[model samples]
Structures are given as structure tokens and as C-alpha cells.
Target: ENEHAHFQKAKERLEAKHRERMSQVMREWEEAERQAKNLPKADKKAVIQHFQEKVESLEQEAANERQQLVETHMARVEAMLNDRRRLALENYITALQAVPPRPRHVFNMLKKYVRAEQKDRQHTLKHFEHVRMVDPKKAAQIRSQVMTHLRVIYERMNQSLSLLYNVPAVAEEIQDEVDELLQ
Candidate 1:
């Protein structure tokens, strides 16, 4: 909601500048048209058409400048997020690869997301009681989700520990496991 409000403010902001530019163009057209009223009728018509085209061209250029300003504003968000945001981004990308369209392949990526989730869940659950006032249905759904998520996270936490942290071509074996999972 707050994110939406921010962009809404942007749309409202600089609107005055946009209106001013448009009014300036309209004034230019009126001034030029008034001057051309003295020319031969055919010539005056051509000049009037040319004026409209010129205004369109100017507005197009103005729009590009305006769009450039909007793009420039996004650059701040690129660097402004606190360090946690990157983890949040990375977590989702990993979650994307692992969570969607199962057969839930990509064990390597799965391992990455799951392990991180497990570690995070440990710290997060400490604050779980904070949501007790939330609707029972929503609360139950979340609890169910966390329960399922932990199952995935800890599923491999201990399994294949020896085969994983022990064997040779070990890297290759892990790669094969991921391939088979995709199959």
C-alpha cells in the first residue's frame, strides 16, 4: 500500500510542470495561427499543419526528457535497499527455482534455499507469537506453510551428510542428484 502511494505521489507531482509545458505549446500554436491568418488561404493551411506537427515533435522530445527523469528516480532504489533486501531478493530467486512447477528439481538450488530457510526459520519463530491476534484462518495457513517449509529445509539437513561431505567426484554426485530430481 505504501509503495503504491509513493508512485501515486509521483504521478501527481510534476503534473503542474507537464500542464505548464502543454499550455505553452497551446499558446505557441495560437500565436502562430493568429499570425498566419494574413497569408494566402492555402499557404496558411499548410503552415497551420506544419505548426501542429512541430508541436507534436516538441512534445515527443519533452516526453523523452520526462521519461528520463522517471528512470533516473529508480536508480536510488537500486542502491538504497538495506543489506537485508539483497538476501530477500536472493531468497526469492532461489525459492522461484525451487518452489515453482514441482517435480521440484534443481537440488543444488533447492539445497541453497532450503538451508537458508531453515536457519531463518529458527530466528523467526522466536517472534511467532506476535501474530497471535491475526485471524485464526490466516494464522493456521501460515503455520501450515512454515511446517511444510521446515520439512523441506531439514529434509536434507542430515541426510547424505556422509555421502555429501565425504565422497569423491562428490561435486559430480551432487550434480547428478540435481539432474535426477529434475527428471
Candidate 2:
């Protein structure tokens, strides 16, 4: 529930900031126009030139401000997503390490879990490939869907590990496994 909320909330925040900045830009432009109107009836050429200059500078400032906002938002959003992605991978590794053992069985339970995990990840990669070949608009939608799918899978895989193991797993070992897999 709260897992997906981070991106959604960040989008909302960026949109609100965008709206506020646009409104401020419009207000500043309106004020400039009013000042131009209330000026003394001096030389017509100089008056028009000064008004245009003010309007041009205001527009330039708005464009620069909007660009900065977009760059900042992109940086923050990417950071949030990369953090989530790494955590999800670590969780999957932890879970795979802690698979429940069967009583009186000669089968390798850990190998079984690893095999299943590899298959599932390959399946997800294929899904991503399919989305990658689609039309542009739907491409973005499906790409996000695929990522969310993996995120949920990893999260639940970790939950299962926690419920079955009850004991702790080594953080360094898990991290190393995740790093190797990531590479």
C-alpha cells in the first residue's frame, strides 16, 4: 500500500509546485502590464520598448525557473525509485536464502527456491521486453506496471522469508548475494 505511495505523492507534489510557479509567473506578468499602463505619457517608442523588455525578462525567468524545477524533481524521483529497486532485490535474496526445509526429504530446498526465483525473474524480463516493443504511450504505462509487479513480488517474497525463518539472516552475506546477482 504505502510502497507505491512514494512515487504517487512525488508526482502530486511536483504538479502542485508547477501550478504555483505558473500562477506566480502570470501574476508577475500582469503586474508588469499594469505598471506599463500606469506610466507617464512620454515617448511612445521608449515606452513600448521598455514594456517589451520587462515582459521578455519575465518570460525568460519563468522558463529558467521551470527548467530547474523539472531537473530537481527528476533527480529526487529517480533516487526514490533506485532505493526501492535495490531494497526489493535484497529482500528477494534474503528470502531465497531462508527457504523452509522439508522434513525427511533429500531434495535441496534452497536450490529449488533459487531455481524458481531465476525463472520468475526471467519471466519478468520477458514481460519488460514485450512492453519495450509497444507503441510509445502504452509503453510508459506497461513499463511502470512491470516495475510495480516486480516490486510487489520481492516484497511478498521477503514477507514469506520472515514468516518461515523466525531467525536472522546475515546482512553482509545477503548484500553480497544481491550485488553478485545485480552484476
Candidate 3:
């Protein structure tokens, strides 16, 4: 629940920042346009040059601000993910401890389960490929949908691993990483 709160706060901050930047850019662009329209037709060279300079400056400023915002937010998310990862590892260790001593055959079975999961991941990738072929024109949309699905899956997987081993840190770290990437 704490993680959810943090995620929501981050999302709101990012959205507010984006809207502020966009509004400023739009206002500047409109003013520049108005100024250009009012320029004397005989002074074409000077008028065009002035408008171009204004546009270039605004574009550079917006780009720099955007880059800075992304970098700062990404760093925060990365830290969160790291914490989650550590937690997950601890949980895994706890789970292992709970298991009774088993013969070599039981250990082999556990390895097989892991391998089976790997194969399932491969199958998921193939499904993505099938979607690409079946909906070429909507590929971008499909990709976005798939990405969202994968993110949830990854989060759950991390949580499970953390619980099984008593390593909550690993899950936290993974969450942080996901948050950064999403931002």
C-alpha cells in the first residue's frame, strides 16, 4: 500500500510538470506567431530571422527542462526498485529454509520447475509475435498493451520470489526499476 501511494504521487507530479511545460510552450509559440504575422512585409528578412530565433530558443529550453525532469524522476524510481530487489532476495531465503530436507530427486524436480517457467516465458514472446502479424497496422497499440501486461506479471513474479525467500528487498528493488522505466 505504501508503494502504491508513492507511485501515485510520482505519477501526479510528472503529469503536472508535463502540463505546465506544455502550456508554457504553447503560449510562447502563439505569441511568436502573432509577432511574425504583424511584421512589415518589406522587412521580410529581419522578421523571419527574429521568429526563427525565438522558436529555436524555446525549443532548446523545453528540451533541456524535459531531460532534467526525466533524469531526476528516473533516479528516484531506480532507488525504489533497488530496495524492492533486496526484499525479494530475503523472502526467497526464508522459503528455502522452510522446506524440509529432501533427496537429490526433489532438488532435481525444483530445477525442472524453473526450466518450465523459462519455457513459458518463451511462449509468451511467441504470442507477441503472433499479434504483430495479425494486426500489423495496430502493432504500436498492441505493443503498448503487451508492455503493460508484462509489467504486472513482472511485479507479481518479484513479489512471489521475495515471499518465498523472505527477501522483501529484492521485490522493492524490482518495483523501483519498473517505476523508473515507466516514467
Residues 34-64, model 3: lDDT tens digits: 7778667766566557656766776676656
RMSD, each candidate, Å? 17.8, 12.4, 12.7
Give the Cα-based TM-score of candidate 3 against the true structure. 0.39
TM-score of 2: 0.37
Candidate 3 runs further than 4 Å off: 1-42, 99-183
Candidate achieving higher TM-score, 1 or 2 = 1
Model 2, position 159, has a per-residue lDDT of: 57
TM-score on alpha carbons, each prediction: 0.39, 0.37, 0.39
lDDT of model number 1: 0.53
Give the per-residue lDDT of model 2 (tens digit) for 1-183.
242365457556766766676677667666766766856667444656765676677567665665565456545644655555455545545544444522212123333443445545555666457546754575676677678867865765555444433333433334444335435
Error of 2 at 148 (Å): 21
Worst-scoring 10-residue span by lDDT in model 1: 160-169
Clashes of each: 0, 0, 37
* Cα misplacement distance, residue 4 of candidate 2 (Å): 11
